[PDB]
Design a protein around this ligand. Structure first.
Ligand SMILES: Nc1ncnc2c1ncn2[C@@H]1O[C@H](COP(=O)(O)OP(=O)(O)O)[C@@H](O)[C@H]1O
Lengths: 640, 154
């Protein structure tokens, strides 16, 4: 039965064990899912692999668990990841060849088999953070989450060393393999002998690429008293740069322990090993949270194709598409989605709705050059306290892929961009991305906006207009792009803002900044009697069930459908208002003027979101009506 | 901000983190100088904004008006201890903090759920509380408005 010395993983016979599986699986997963696609996954998918030749079969883990056999191999993969992954790689290659010989001549012809096929297992285990982990698990597959603070530039790493001679000279080279380069003392040509120095020429040797991604993890389920830890994961090879800074990422990889020299002169090692993650697989996109835009991605589509890769942009099946294009037909859709956004949150539908358009906001324009008005639409909302105004922030924060959530007074103009901190790992000066730069794309959420210090808010006059930030300070001088929506919460002085008084006075703020916001919500309580009873019916529920179920029920609601819908809407639609709009469009603006020109900008952007929804490449003359009314909605609330 | 629980957000300098504080807060404060002037409305002699007080579910205002009968009892208490270390006699048994902490520990484990009846009752009483808080309308008395956080609070 052979063995491997420490691994209790018998070479081969796990290859058989893996093959009967690989060739025959289908779905036993649904027996765990409980059921309620027919044919097996892997031969089909491995075929797609073989024509596309993308390599990188990423498996699942667990497809294995639960299926027999391989009930064991799952354990053997979680425990002894590297070796087992090497075995599996071999197996998959051989399975390729053996699959080819069935079809005779394949892909012209025998080359593609010798090309390296490798596994990127994912979805492995439910693990608790990083911090929780014992020294008992030094090498194991492990899951992580949480946004990415910074990433170093690519560090070159040896693969095949190179050597030349003083005599004669001869060019031969020793390959690294294990982690040291052992050079022959002497010699080749002459040989001889002779004890002549063997030169190492470092430009002729072959490298691979090792990057290092710092990571701020959220395990959630926080045991306390713990504060967020930071981690460093070294990627490798193709995965390099495949992760932008600020993303929320699912990455899996092998835990690791390495010493780091203390003196940097002496041979001495510091004991007390320093630990890090090796990140075999990254899982950027998610089902539960919304999908990134295309325009922002750009190059990483235009690039990452050439060297190829996997994952990135969320992919959609056909029949579900057939479901979206069906749901679009439903007339109450614009209403429907509005109730579906915040299930817990009751009434106040136009807030839910304006935000609904904040999710679809605008259409991006480059002109010949410059231009760049983006899709950005920005929303302040104020009112009596306990109105859920913060809850929305939480929710939008949860959905929006890249967004970042900031409190008032916990903020400073230095904090929102360009820290230029000391790195302290290398004892170097490294640039960090501020909070708005991270928030670039998607939605920045802001608490207690009224309360920001006077020096702050001086950042926003830059962002709101330019849509970029201009940093001339300190080390590096550049204008860097942050294109981001803003959703700001405000508490009027009252704090009940009260009848009469100038409202425009009663939000506080400088009025110029205040006029700048796209859509400004003012929420108020008319003490409907006749309301509080209904609302209490809503909230005083749960109650039952203790395990939360049927929140808004009975109400028709989409759940994961609305995210793939929203995504789809964003990437595959680019609305234009054509001719029909302009007349009514203008007369609205004048009607308001009879305020400032921004309000117009607002309307044409906000409206195009409406039209972005409903899958219309062109705006109707209709739909600009409510698109105004939303601005007028706050006016029906400005009467008092 | 911490009454949104689960949050602080530090954007300054070398910190972008949002850490989790599950904290409870008890706050002892003194009314505007010198002590609770009754010729002033509530919220006048409490210097604190209404944005914050809506968060507090229970505000115990302890005001002192001299009373000949009671202050005798008090004086008897604070004289009895000092004079003795152990306060209660004839009769009560003070629960030791250790075993008490044990009981509370065994208490936190339950996660109860409301019946329908108590639910409806909560609702109706909430309308009456809202309506009675606002019909108060202008000043004295108050604090209004008995915002939903008081309902959820109760
Ligand atoms: N219409 C509503 N639907 C659901 N929950 C509500 C509604 N109005 C208020 N609430 C509840 O009241 C609380 C609102 O607090 P919040 O509005 O964040 O305070 P503030 O207005 O001071 O920011 C939330 O827990 C929310 O669930």
């Amino acid at each position: 039965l052979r063995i491997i010395w420490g691994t209790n993983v018998s070479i081969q016979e796990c290859t058989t064990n893996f093959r009967n599986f690989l060739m025959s699986f289908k779905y036993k997963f649904r027996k765990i899912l409980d059921e309620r696609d027919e044919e097996l996954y892997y031969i089909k998918q491995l075929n797609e692999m073989r024509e596309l030749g993308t390599s990188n079969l990423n498996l699942d883990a667990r497809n294995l668990l639960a299926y027999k056999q391989t009930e064991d191999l799952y354990h053997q993969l979680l425990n002894y990841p590297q070796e087992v992954i090497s075995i599996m790689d071999q197996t998959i290659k051989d399975c390729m060849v053996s699959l080819i010989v069935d079809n005779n001549l394949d892909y012209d012809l025998d080359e593609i088999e010798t090309k390296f096929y490798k596994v990127r297992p994912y979805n492995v285990g439910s693990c608790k953070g990083m911090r929780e982990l014992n020294p008992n698990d030094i090498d194991k597959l492990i899951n992580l989450k949480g946004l990415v603070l910074r990433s170093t530039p690519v560090i070159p790493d040896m693969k095949v060393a190179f050597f030349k001679c003083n005599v004669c000279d001869h060019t031969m080279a020793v390959e690294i393999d294990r982690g040291v380069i052992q050079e022959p003392a002497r010699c080749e040509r002459i040989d001889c002998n002779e004890p002549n120095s063997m030169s190492l020429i470092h430009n002729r040797c072959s490298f691979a690429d090792k990057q290092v991604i710092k990571l701020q993890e959220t395990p959630d389920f926080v045991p306390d008293g713990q504060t967020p830890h930071s981690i460093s994961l070294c990627v490798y090879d193709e995965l390099v740069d495949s992760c932008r800074a600020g993303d929320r990422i699912e990455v899996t990889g092998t835990f690791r322990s390495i010493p780091i020299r203390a003196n940097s002169r002496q041979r001495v090692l510091k004991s007390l090993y320093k630990t890090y993650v090796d990140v075999v697989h990254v899982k950027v996109s998610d089902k539960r949270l919304d999908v990134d835009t295309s325009t922002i991605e750009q190059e990483l589509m235009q690039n990452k194709v050439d060297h190829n890769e996997v994952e990135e942009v969320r992919q959609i099946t056909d029949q579900d598409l057939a479901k979206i294009r069906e749901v679009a037909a439903r007339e109450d859709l614009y209403s429907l989605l509005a109730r579906s956004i915040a299930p817990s949150i009751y009434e106040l539908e136009d807030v839910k709705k304006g935000i609904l358009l904040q999710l679809f906001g605008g259409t991006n324009k480059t002109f010949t050059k410059g231009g760049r008005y983006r899709g950005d639409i920005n929303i302040l909302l104020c009112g009596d306290p306990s109105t859920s105004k913060s809850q929305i922030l939480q929710y939008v924060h949860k959905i929006t892929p890249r967004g970042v959530y900031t409190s008032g007074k916990g903020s400073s103009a230095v904090g929102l961009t360009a820290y230029i901190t000391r790195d302290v790992d290398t004892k170097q000066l490294v640039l960090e991305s501020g909070a708005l730069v991270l928030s670039d794309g998607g939605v920045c959420c802001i608490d207690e906006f009224d309360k920001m210090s006077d020096s702050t808010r001086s950042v926003l006059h830059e962002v709101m207009e330019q849509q970029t930030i201009s940093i001339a300070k300190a080390g590096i001088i550049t204008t860097l792009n942050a294109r981001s929506s803003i959703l700001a919460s405000a508490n009027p002085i009252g704090s009940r803002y009260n009848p009469n008084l100038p409202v425009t006075e009663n939000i506080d703020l400088p009025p110029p900044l205040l006029s700048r916001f796209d859509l400004v919500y003012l929420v108020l309580d008319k003490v409907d009697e006749k309301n509080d009873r209904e609302l209490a019916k809503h909230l005083t529920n749960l109650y039952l069930e203790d395990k939360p179920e049927h929140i808004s029920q009975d109400d028709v609601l989409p759940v994961e459908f609305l995210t793939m819908y929203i995504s789809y809407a964003k990437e595959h639609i680019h609305p234009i208002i054509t001719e029909a709009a302009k007349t009514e469009l203008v007369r609205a603006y004048v009607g308001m003027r009879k305020a400032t020109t921004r309000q117009l900008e607002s309307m044409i952007r906000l409206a195009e979101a409406h039209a972005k929804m409903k899958l219309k490449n062109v705006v109707e003359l209709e739909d600009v009506q409510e698109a105004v009314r939303l601005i007028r909605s706050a006016i029906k609330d400005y009467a008092t | 901000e911490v009454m949104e629980q689960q949050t602080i957000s530090i954007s300054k300098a070398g910190i972008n983190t949002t850490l989790n504080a599950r904290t409870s807060i008890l706050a002892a404060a003194n009314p505007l100088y010198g002590r609770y002037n009754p010729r002033l409305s509530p919220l006048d002699n409490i210097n604190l904004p209404a944005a914050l007080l809506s968060r507090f579910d229970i505000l115990f205002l302890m005001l002192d008006i001299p009373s000949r009968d009671d202050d005798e009892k008090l004086a008897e208490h604070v004289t009895y201890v000092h004079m003795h270390n152990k306060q209660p006699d004839l009769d009560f048994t003070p629960v030791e903090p250790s075993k008490m902490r044990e009981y509370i520990a065994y208490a936190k484990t339950k996660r109860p759920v409301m019946s329908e009846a108590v639910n409806d009752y909560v609702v109706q009483a909430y309308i009456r509380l809202r309506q009675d808080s606002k019909r108060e309308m202008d000043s004295k008395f108050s604090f209004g408005q008995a915002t939903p956080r008081t309902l959820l609070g109760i």
